[PDB]
Design a protein around this nucleic acid. Structure first.
Ligand code: ZN
Ligand code: ZN
Ligand code: ZN
Ligand code: ZN
Lengths: 194, 194, 194, 194
DNA sequence: GAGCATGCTCA
DNA sequence: TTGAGCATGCTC
DNA sequence: GAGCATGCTCA
DNA sequence: TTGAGCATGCTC
């Protein structure tokens, strides 16, 4: 979760460099290791490895509340959006994180913790690339009443083999909001105190 | 829609300068009540003559703008599912009457609009009006509900058979800070009055 | 159509006076007898009569292209909007004009000319009012490709008795567009040449 | 997605300064073709070695932005129903090949994407490239279709079995005035180049 | 709402 | 047949 | 994007 | 319990 290890494959995440039109809907903050994005907008997250993972490897994405006081609560879409008609025909209505660009994502709910997660097969970079890109979408604002309700979350991306064993793990905070650029500057300026 | 009828029926609101004003404050220039969610709002019933025996008072909410007037005013998805019920009011109803052991919560079979009805009671000896306490269970801003759309509360005096005897109305804004918001709307309004 | 007669009841239309927030979505131009409005926005049209119409009277609204070269073509929604999911559960998908605020409008298609029209019962003004208001909605922009395709239209409002006989008739041009205020000024300034 | 393969495959476009430029003009700095609706666009196929016998060339359109990349690119509701068919191309297809009596119009059974395939033909004696003429049947602005969303045309060289031999691509903007629009996008682009 | 984005009209 | 200028929805 | 619109945090 | 100021989606 909060702990990130590269494992035997040197796994870790990367984010889009600044200076692109995508920045308006999705912008990453290095000093805060936090992604600021708008609701239902595709966010390109990069997967970096120093060695090819075993055949059949998978990449899972899960959201957990950052504050230890809310860590046990399952992150889910608020009552309103869970009922909106925005389903892609693949993602369940209550899931916050969706993968865009994949015909066969696996949307899971842990039988014990009841946490939602989405899994897609691991794919190596395109020829001439040092990373693989997976586009994610967050279907609720961090402010949504009855949902995240202004509570910040962390997205945990874990590399696992075909059997479900962890091969690597990385994470980043996320704020789904109306104005990513504005809100990112705010938190960064506020951060400039130490 | 505002007629006093044969009984001089019209509404009244408590004058300013009371601790209650913080949670509920009426604006004469805008004929608009500003109140907090779930807080009791005292509305006064005034008549020039005693209504026929068995008369009733109905409260109903409708969106003020013709653009949304046909949409039934109801609580948003989140609050409907909160456990704030009083054991009398249906979960979807926005307006609840406080202090009455026997209110009637109705849904019109044709328009599907919600309304609450209580018996008409004469003023207490020494008073010139009757007070009914209402509570609004969603903010005007609630996503998936009123969603920032202003509403009007329509109070009608009816005989035992359901015939209208009189009708009055006022705009309502349920919000976190009634005082602040009332001033804001009044100042804007006054920005044309001088 | 183009000819307007008040009949034995002095029937004629009236429009909302300027200086209201509604003006942004719906604004009438007197010198051009033209209504500029946005798509799917409620337009309050006033019905004026000097005498009470016979019991069972009806008010019909129909759209016809203004140019004699297109007069024979039936005005309908373009291919795209006819398939959008904006139906109110009462109006057929191809109809341009819809009535808002009525539970029982009659949406018709002339068996011979195939022209669409919507009919609602005539209702007298509210007490203290000199006119009756009917809210209409136009479901396509005048510019819609494959629909009105930049061709201006006329809305014909006719008062008819219970049997379908004409009692009165009035009309006005309409431009459904993105910016009513902007476009109204444009045509008015252009009109200022004579 | 751009690799020349073992046959040095890549695309070429006619140089500027031809009457054709008015209906079809390529922009080197933006690797973007600007063309009018239904106008033939000559695309050049270049290879350094003769492809295996039975090779084919496929053309497919995809939305450039990851936000819309999964949505199948197709003609809008209006043009699909226009009677501009050539008796070969399905009504919903955006890209049509001109000058070939036997093109194959396909729809992938899984992604449902449209594509058109024609046999690979060697350059005419004396030429260093092969020309294929394509037509785009909707403007990039068509409502209910591309709806102002930029697209990419992907041309792939494949052997007789369907295996990719090479692949290249270019952005496309179908519009009313290619020259004007090309300059506009280039000037903006140049507003960072100096 | 402004300004940008874009098909259509006019000579 | 071709822009130039007018006409018009969309971005923020 | 700016500025307005509004619930929540803090003392 | 109450604003003041901060936090944030929506209007145009
Ligand atoms: Zn939500
Ligand atoms: Zn609510
Ligand atoms: Zn249309
Ligand atoms: Zn089209």
């Amino acid at each position: 979760s909060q702990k990130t290890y590269q494992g035997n494959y040197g796994f870790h995440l990367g984010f889009l460099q600044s200076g692109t039109a995508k920045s308006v809907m999705c912008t990453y903050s290095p000093p805060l290791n936090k992604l600021f994005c708008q609701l239902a907008k595709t966010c390109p997250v990069q997967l970096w490895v120093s060695a090819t993972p075993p055949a059949g490897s998978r990449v899972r994405a899960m959201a957990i509340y950052k504050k230890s006081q809310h860590m046990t609560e399952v992150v889910r879409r608020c009552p309103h959006h869970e009922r909106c008609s925005d389903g892609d025909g693949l993602a369940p209505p209550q899931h916050l994180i969706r993968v865009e660009g994949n015909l066969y994502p696996e949307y899971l709910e842990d039988r014990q913790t009841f946490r939602h997660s989405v899994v897609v097969p691991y794919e190596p970079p395109e020829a001439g690339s040092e990373y693989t890109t997976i586009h994610y979408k967050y279907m609720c604002n961090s402010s949504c009443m009855g949902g995240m309700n202004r509570r910040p979350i962390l997205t945990i991306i874990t590399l696992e083999d075909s059997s479900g064993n962890l091969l690597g793990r990385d994470s980043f905070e996320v704020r789904v909001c109306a104005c990513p650029g504005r809100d990112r500057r705010t938190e960064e300026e506020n951060f400039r105190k130490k």
